[PDB]
Amino acid sequence: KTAVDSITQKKFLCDRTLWRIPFSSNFMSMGALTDLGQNLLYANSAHALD
Amino acid sequence: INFASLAPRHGSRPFMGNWQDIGTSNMSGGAFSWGSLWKAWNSSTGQMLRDKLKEQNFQQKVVDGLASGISGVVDLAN
Amino acid sequence: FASLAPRHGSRPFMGNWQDIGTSNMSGGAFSWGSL
Amino acid sequence: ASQLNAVVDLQDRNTELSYQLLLDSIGDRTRYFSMWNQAVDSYDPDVRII
Amino acid sequence: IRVGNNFAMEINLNANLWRNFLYSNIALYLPDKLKYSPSNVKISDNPNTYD
């Protein structure tokens, strides 16, 4: 009945895991060799990543 | 040049496994079956022991080596 | 044929011919999957 | 019709044990079925193995 | 009014629980050769009885 005013904190834990960002068109796992991996621009050229 | 004689015989018929089974697995997109399904502050004793027994044993559906058990229905946990 | 089968389609639902079975403790098993 | 018995029970078989192993093989004894007293004997591992 | 701390007594809890559990569930099942016979109490001469 005499509770004091409050403020909420949210956090999450995820251990024993690796974040993944697949290099695929729709992020799905449509196979080992993703279509973007076979995309001709990435296949017949050079690029720089930042 | 026929290697059928090397295989176990299931009765007048060699036990030739499926040719479509040669391994392939990688980081993502490769999943295999048989998943990780699973001073007492609390004295209940009972369910506790029972639970420990459960913890040491197993159950699933593609465990179809041999037989499922009599009358039937086809179910999940594929 | 058989009309005594559950029909999940116009086509009947029938299992494999080879369905009749055995296991002896033996290890005369220790054999593989349904797949 | 004919008094010939159809059960020829030697004393070399151990039918109880065979049924126990068959029950283990087909199903999983960990579950309990009160109809046939299907309650496999077991021990607390922290008692057997200290 | 109490001067100084209050009177109190100490006991280890987890040790006591563990000791009870161990003593019962192991000691009461050792082979009878390690066990002995009590004093001033009648006991069955048959080793196979519950008594």
UniProtKB/Swiss-Prot annotation, chain B:
UniProt keyword Plastid, yes or no: no
Ubl conjugation listed as a keyword: yes
Propeptide segment residues: 1-30
Ranges for region Interaction with hexon protein: 39-56
Superkingdom as given in the UniProt entry: Viruses
Keywords of this entry: Capsid protein, Cytoplasmic inwards viral transport, Disulfide bond, Host cytoplasm, Host nucleus, Host-virus interaction, Late protein, Microtubular inwards viral transport, Phosphoprotein, Ubl conjugation, Viral capsid assembly, Viral penetration into host cytoplasm, Viral penetration via lysis of host organellar membrane, Viral release from host cell, Virion, Virus entry into host cell
Site (Cleavage): G30, A31
Record motif Nuclear export signal, residues: 49-58
Modified how: Ubiquitinated by Nedd4 following partial capsid disassembly; which might play a role in intracellular virus movement during entry.
Biological processes annotated in GO: lysis of host organelle involved in viral entry into host cell; microtubule-dependent intracellular transport of viral material towards nucleus; protein transport along microtubule; viral life cycle; viral release from host cell
GO cellular component: host cell; host cell cytoplasm; host cell nucleus; viral capsid; viral procapsid
Induction pattern: Expressed in the late phase of the viral replicative cycle.
Additional free-text comment from the UniProt record: All late proteins expressed from the major late promoter are produced by alternative splicing and alternative polyadenylation of the same gene giving rise to non-overlapping ORFs. A leader sequence is present in the N-terminus of all these mRNAs and is recognized by the viral shutoff protein to provide expression although conventional translation via ribosome scanning from the cap has been shut off in the host cell.
Domain remark from Swiss-Prot or TrEMBL: N-terminal amphipathic alpha-helix domain is essential for the membrane lytic activity. Late-budding domains (L domains) are short sequence motifs essential for viral particle release. They can occur individually or in close proximity within structural proteins. They interacts with sorting cellular proteins of the multivesicular body (MVB) pathway. Most of these proteins are class E vacuolar protein sorting factors belonging to ESCRT-I, ESCRT-II or ESCRT-III complexes. Minor capsid protein 6 contains one L domain: a PPXY motif which binds to the WW domains of HECT (homologous to E6-AP C-terminus) E3 ubiquitin ligases, like NEDD4.
Family named by the database record: Belongs to the adenoviridae protein VI family.
Name this protein carries in UniProt: Pre-protein VI
UniProt organism field: Human adenovirus C serotype 5 (HAdV-5)
Residue window of the full protein shown: 4 to 96 of 250
UniProtKB/Swiss-Prot annotation, chain D:
Expression triggers: Expressed in the late phase of the viral replicative cycle.
Parent-protein start and end of this portion: 352 to 401 of 952
Subcellular location: Virion; Host nucleus
Function: Major capsid protein that self-associates to form 240 hexon trimers, each in the shape of a hexagon, building most of the pseudo T=25 capsid. Assembled into trimeric units with the help of the chaperone shutoff protein. Transported by pre-protein VI to the nucleus where it associates with other structural proteins to form an empty capsid. Might be involved, through its interaction with host dyneins, in the intracellular microtubule-dependent transport of incoming viral capsid to the nucleus.
Note: All late proteins expressed from the major late promoter are produced by alternative splicing and alternative polyadenylation of the same gene giving rise to non-overlapping ORFs. A leader sequence is present in the N-terminus of all these mRNAs and is recognized by the viral shutoff protein to provide expression although conventional translation via ribosome scanning from the cap has been shut off in the host cell.
Gene coding for it: L3
Entry's family note: Belongs to the adenoviridae hexon protein family.
Organism classification: Viruses, Varidnaviria, Bamfordvirae, Preplasmiviricota, Tectiliviricetes
Record's protein name: Hexon protein
Subunit structure: Homotrimer. Interacts with the capsid vertex protein; this interaction binds the peripentonal hexons to the neighboring penton base. Interacts with the hexon-linking protein; this interaction tethers the hexons surrounding the penton to those situated in the central plate of the facet. Interacts with the hexon-interlacing protein; this interaction lashes the hexons together. Interacts with host dyneins DYNC1LI1 and DYNC1I2; this interaction might be involved in intracellular microtubule-dependent transport of incoming viral capsid.
Transmembrane portions of the chain: none
